[PDB]
Copies of this chain bind each other. A is one copy, B any other.
Amino acid sequence: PFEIEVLLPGELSPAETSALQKCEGKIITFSTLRHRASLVDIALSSYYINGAPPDTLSLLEAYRMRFAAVITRVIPGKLLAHAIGVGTPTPGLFIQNTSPVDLCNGDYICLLPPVFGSADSIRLDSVGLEIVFPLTIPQTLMREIIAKVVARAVERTDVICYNGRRYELETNLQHRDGSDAAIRTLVLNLMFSINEGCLLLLALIPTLLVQGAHDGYVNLLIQTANCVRETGQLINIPPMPRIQDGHRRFPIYETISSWISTSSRLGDTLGTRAILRVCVFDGPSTVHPGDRTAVIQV
């Protein structure tokens, strides 16, 4: 299909030319889409604006706003790249397991700033710009680091163990450009989450505990509900109310519909669109660091 063309920068260095001609696999992101681009827009100096380093939230929203692309094979004659447009097959590509850990089959690969570790910085000797290869994972540790960073942001104003493996992280938060967005979205979620069923739920704690006394599913909630039980007795606990009509009234349906709508909204806002579903053949679906695979469009 359609393919973009990027002009080759001058003063080519064989040290990185050999790596580019051997690997042909890397995930990159771009903002300006153009078939004929000579200097594109991936410039750290241009993105530095005033001079202060970008914040984690600023980088996150910039990545969310910007699109994604997959680097195809590179020929000495000209540089070719493939962008992500509509849901159509894109044959003639190549991918590699950039992440140091294995990836499950049918996983949507996302783009995140390098925060997992100090990745190698390839300082190009050209004059145009330089390219830095990130090393992150799509969602596994992302779903935890986003929670940690939002918790830190809301509290201002680590060690993760999995199968005997310890992972280290380095947080960075020095700007308040995203604090306003964070507080706005959290207050919007709080305003959209309150419904009329909470009063009924709070007015049923004795019946709930009586039912759960001979059920066994109590520890799985009380191991973490250290304050929920304390706050349960500090509420109105009103008696059974009277509905204005008992023929076509059901607040349960309204509140579950509102919860479904809010959950869909938050999933859409926090979910990066990436239509990448590979299909393995013959060999196992689990990938290993140091192997080469193909591209399959579904």
A residues at B contact (CB < 8 Å): 2, 31-35, 65, 67, 86-87, 89, 91, 105-106, 139, 143-144, 146-148, 150-151, 154-155, 157, 184-185, 187-204, 207, 211, 217, 220-221, 224-228, 231, 250, 252-261, 263-268, 270-271, 277, 279-282, 284-285, 297-298
- The answer to whether A195 and B196 have CB atoms under 8 Å apart is no
Q: How far is the CB of A279 from chain B (nearest CB, A)?
A: 7
Task: Please give me the residue from chain B that is nearest to A215 by CB atom.
Answer: B184
Q: Considering only CB atoms, which chain B residue lies closest to A2 in the complex? A: B281
Tell me if B267 and A271 are in contact (CB < 8 A).
yes
CA distance A297 to B88 in the complex (A): 12
Residues of B within 8 A of A139 (CB): 268
With A143-B268, A150-B260, A151-B250 given, name 10 new contacts (CB 8 A): A2-B281, A32-B105, A147-B257, A155-B252, A187-B207, A189-B221, A193-B197, A195-B228, A227-B252, A267-B270
A67-B201 contact given A146-B264, A268-B139, CB 8 Å threshold: no
Pick 25 A–B contacts, CB within 8 A, sort by A: A67-B106, A67-B277, A67-B298, A86-B297, A87-B91, A143-B265, A143-B268, A144-B264, A148-B253, A150-B260, A157-B211, A185-B220, A187-B207, A188-B217, A190-B204, A191-B197, A191-B201, A192-B225, A193-B198, A195-B198, A199-B231, A225-B255, A227-B250, A228-B255, A267-B268
Residues of B within 8 A of A200 (CB): 190
Is there contact, CB below 8 Å, between A197 and B201?
Answer: no
| Complex Cα spacing A294 to B40, Å | 29
User: Do the beta carbons of A190 and B185 come within 8 Å of each other?
Assistant: no
Nearest residue (CB) in B for A204 is B190
CB-CB under 8 A for A226 and B198, given A263-B267, A265-B143, A282-B34:
no
Main secondary structure of the interface of A (DSSP, over half): helix
Residues in chain B near residue A207, CB distance under 8 A? 187
Say whether B197 contacts A197, CB under 8 Å: no
Nearest-CB residue, chain B, relative to A230? B250
What's the least CB distance linking A267 to chain B, in Å? Answer: 4
Nearest neighbor of A220 in chain B, beta-carbon distance: B185
| 3 closest A-B pairs by CB | A198-B198, A193-B197, A190-B201
Chain B residues whose CB sits within 8 angstroms of the CB of A105 once the complex forms: 31-32, 65
Q: Is the CB of B193 within 8 A of A221?
A: no
